[PDB]
């Protein structure tokens, strides 16, 4: 139904292997789309369908926004530590924002800072003022909310415009590939024996991410057995799920795996 553009910033006080001090990825609704990091400071597409769609103009525009947000964030991680009295240690700061387009003309948005795995400070969407989660984000709350800075009215003008303008535009470019239904192969197996039997029900290769797979005995829902919905991703669009069921105490009789996915009608697979 709805579609979302959204950006994720991660900034750290000391780098490590794999991590640059600062880096960005932006999702367009499920696909990873944009990328930037502080080693070789450049904004890149991250998916074929963003390649060769916007000119050199754009991108250098984007690389400059990113090269500007980088130092103010390395700075903020050192400031945050100070409000908490920390001198040693590695520390992280995380930023999230995004717009959601939906329904008819409905717009929704969010913008939040997180210092370590804890929410620090965040924007109320109808009131349009930043509300801290913590004492230490009171001094931030006041700088930003003040008349002279007025960050609520600035980000409001981005969240209600540029973000959606850019969303609408990127949805266009990835139109052919974002709705694109691809549907599940399914491969039942049943590990081992002894008294009762295991029964794995492997579905794979599908898009979108959402599915439902039960084990049905004749015409009644079977049993839990562990994990629950662990829909795993593949390194394309595709997704994957496996449901297990400890069964036959001894009686037998016609088990079956009921898949229910957005490319279908029903789909039902029999025993062995």
């Amino acid at each position: 139904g709805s579609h979302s553009l959204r950006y994720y910033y991660t900034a750290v006080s000391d780098r490590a292997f794999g991590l640059p001090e600062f880096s960005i990825v932006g999702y367009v609704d499920d696909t990873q789309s944009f990328r930037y990091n502080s080693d070789n400071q450049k904004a890149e597409p991250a998916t074929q369908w963003m390649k060769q769609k916007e000119g050199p103009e754009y991108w250098e525009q984007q690389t400059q926004i990113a090269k500007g947000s980088e130092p103010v964030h390395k700075h903020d991680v050192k400031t945050a530590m100070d409000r908490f009295n920390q001198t040693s240690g590695t520390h992280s700061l995380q930023v999230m924002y995004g717009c959601e387009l939906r329904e008819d003309n409905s717009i929704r948005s969010y913008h939040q800072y997180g210092y370590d795995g804890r929410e620090f400070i965040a924007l109320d969407t109808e009131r349009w003022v930043y509300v801290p989660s913590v004492r230490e984000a009171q001094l931030t709350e006041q700088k930003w909310n003040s008349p002279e800075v007025n960050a609520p009215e600035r980000n409001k003008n981005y969240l209600q415009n540029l973000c959606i303008e850019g969303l609408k535009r990127y949805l266009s470019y990835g139109r052919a590939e974002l709705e694109r239904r691809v549907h599940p192969h399914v491969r039942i197996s049943d590990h081992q024996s002894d008294d009762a039997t295991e029964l794995r029900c492997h579905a794979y290769g599908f898009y979108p991410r959402e599915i439902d797979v039960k084990w049905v005995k004749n015409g009644r829902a079977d049993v839990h057995s562990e994990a629950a919905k662990e829909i795993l991703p593949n390194p394309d669009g595709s997704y994957q799920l496996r449901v297990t069921a400890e069964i036959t105490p001894s009686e037998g009789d016609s088990y079956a795996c009921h898949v229910e996915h957005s490319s279908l009608k029903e789909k039902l697979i029999v025993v062995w």
Binding site: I24, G26, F34, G68, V72, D76, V149, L162
Partner: peptide, 9 residues
């Protein structure tokens, strides 16, 4: 497009 910069915290 991504958000301009933001103030230092």
């Amino acid at each position: 497009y991504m958000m301009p910069r933001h103030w230092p915290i």
